[PDB]
Design a protein around this motif. Structure first.
Motif, mmCIF file in Angstrom:
data_model
loop_
_atom_site.group_PDB
_atom_site.id
_atom_site.type_symbol
_atom_site.label_atom_id
_atom_site.label_comp_id
_atom_site.label_asym_id
_atom_site.label_seq_id
_atom_site.Cartn_x
_atom_site.Cartn_y
_atom_site.Cartn_z
ATOM 1 N N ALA A 6 34.343 -21.186 -0.587
ATOM 2 C CA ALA A 6 34.724 -22.062 -1.696
ATOM 3 C C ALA A 6 36.242 -22.052 -1.753
ATOM 4 N N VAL A 7 36.822 -23.246 -1.873
ATOM 5 C CA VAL A 7 38.269 -23.430 -1.959
ATOM 6 C C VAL A 7 38.649 -24.229 -3.213
ATOM 7 N N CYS A 8 39.706 -23.752 -3.857
ATOM 8 C CA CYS A 8 40.342 -24.556 -4.858
ATOM 9 C C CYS A 8 41.817 -24.559 -4.562
ATOM 10 N N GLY A 9 42.428 -25.695 -4.824
ATOM 11 C CA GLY A 9 43.838 -25.811 -4.580
ATOM 12 C C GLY A 9 44.591 -26.825 -5.422
ATOM 13 N N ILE B 203 36.961 -15.500 -10.439
ATOM 14 C CA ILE B 203 37.113 -16.878 -10.806
ATOM 15 C C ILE B 203 38.596 -17.259 -10.754
ATOM 16 N N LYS B 204 38.866 -18.500 -10.338
ATOM 17 C CA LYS B 204 40.215 -19.037 -10.273
ATOM 18 C C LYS B 204 40.230 -20.485 -10.740
ATOM 19 N N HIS B 205 41.165 -20.818 -11.643
ATOM 20 C CA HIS B 205 41.344 -22.161 -12.088
ATOM 21 C C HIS B 205 42.693 -22.692 -11.630
ATOM 22 N N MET B 206 42.699 -23.943 -11.187
ATOM 23 C CA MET B 206 43.901 -24.713 -10.840
ATOM 24 C C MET B 206 43.898 -25.908 -11.804
ATOM 25 N N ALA C 156 40.340 -27.682 -11.217
ATOM 26 C CA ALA C 156 39.583 -27.284 -10.055
ATOM 27 C C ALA C 156 39.295 -25.803 -10.234
ATOM 28 N N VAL C 157 38.042 -25.413 -10.033
ATOM 29 C CA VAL C 157 37.650 -24.009 -10.128
ATOM 30 C C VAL C 157 36.910 -23.565 -8.875
ATOM 31 N N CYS C 158 37.200 -22.347 -8.459
ATOM 32 C CA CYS C 158 36.380 -21.697 -7.433
ATOM 33 C C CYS C 158 36.037 -20.323 -7.952
ATOM 34 N N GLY C 159 34.856 -19.893 -7.589
ATOM 35 C CA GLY C 159 34.383 -18.594 -8.072
ATOM 36 C C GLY C 159 33.369 -17.926 -7.159
ATOM 37 N N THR D 59 32.256 -24.044 -6.366
ATOM 38 C CA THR D 59 33.384 -24.785 -6.880
ATOM 39 C C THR D 59 32.918 -25.747 -7.961
ATOM 40 N N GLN D 60 33.865 -26.212 -8.756
ATOM 41 C CA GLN D 60 33.596 -27.248 -9.737
ATOM 42 C C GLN D 60 34.922 -27.999 -10.029
ATOM 43 N N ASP D 61 34.791 -29.289 -10.279
ATOM 44 C CA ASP D 61 35.904 -30.170 -10.665
ATOM 45 C C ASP D 61 35.564 -30.761 -12.022
#
Ligand SMILES: [Cl-]
Lengths: 123, 118
Positions: free
Chosen positions: A81-84, B60-63, B81-84, B93-95
């Motif tokens: 899984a990628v977020c950027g 978890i990470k949010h952009m 944008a989230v990845c976890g 992921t989720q948008d």
């Protein structure tokens, strides 16, 4: 293990010189890497690709499920899984699978990245 | 700005109580928040939600793109944008878009989380 060090070193390499060196150290000089089917070869090409990802994005984060044996073949694979955040400020995500092979020294000699088909459209 | 501090505090709150306390400080006690189209009210409910996110996930990470004025109304909004990594090991992921309202004192009083219609 090299495959387990990969994602965190990739993310840290955006800003960190030493992490970049360690990231390159994971790979055989003759690495074959594949990006949605397009094959590339060698460490020069790999360094150019990583550098490109970092110029294209202000930030990037990878998470991975865990490297497991592939159903077919001699490789290992993991969901990721990628977020950027792009250089232009916009944000994005991506899901996919990476498929890899190690040499006897434990270095990465094959790495294929297969992004999933997307489902943004709903109608 | 309180809204610009939100995302990084949220992620840092998983592993640092000071970040959690700072995160909570951004909100009005009258916060109305929306998750999956379902509305909740109050800081107690908000704290319970944040804590649930961290038991449900190992990471978890949010952009976020940037908070801009909404087309109508007095709200601000941002793409995110989230990845976890779930507690079960799986990743995702989720948008989506967040829509927020600040009260006159600059505290977050309305926050709707709107994942994309995928
Ligand atoms: Cl796990």
């Amino acid at each position: 293990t090299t495959l387990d060090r990969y994602f965190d070193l990739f993310d840290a390499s955006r800003t960190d010189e030493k992490a970049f060196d360690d990231l390159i150290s994971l790979f055989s000089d003759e690495i074959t890497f594949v990006l949605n089917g397009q094959e590339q070869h060698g460490i020069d090409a790999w360094k150019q690709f990583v550098r490109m990802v970092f110029t294209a994005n202000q930030d990037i984060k990878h998470m991975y499920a865990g490297w497991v044996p592939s159903e077919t073949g001699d490789t290992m694979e993991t969901r990721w899984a990628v977020c950027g955040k792009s250089a232009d400020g916009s944000v994005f995500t991506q899901d996919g699978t990476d498929i890899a092979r190690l040499n006897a020294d434990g270095k990465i000699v094959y790495l294929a990245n297969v992004p999933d088909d997307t489902a943004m459209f709903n109608q």
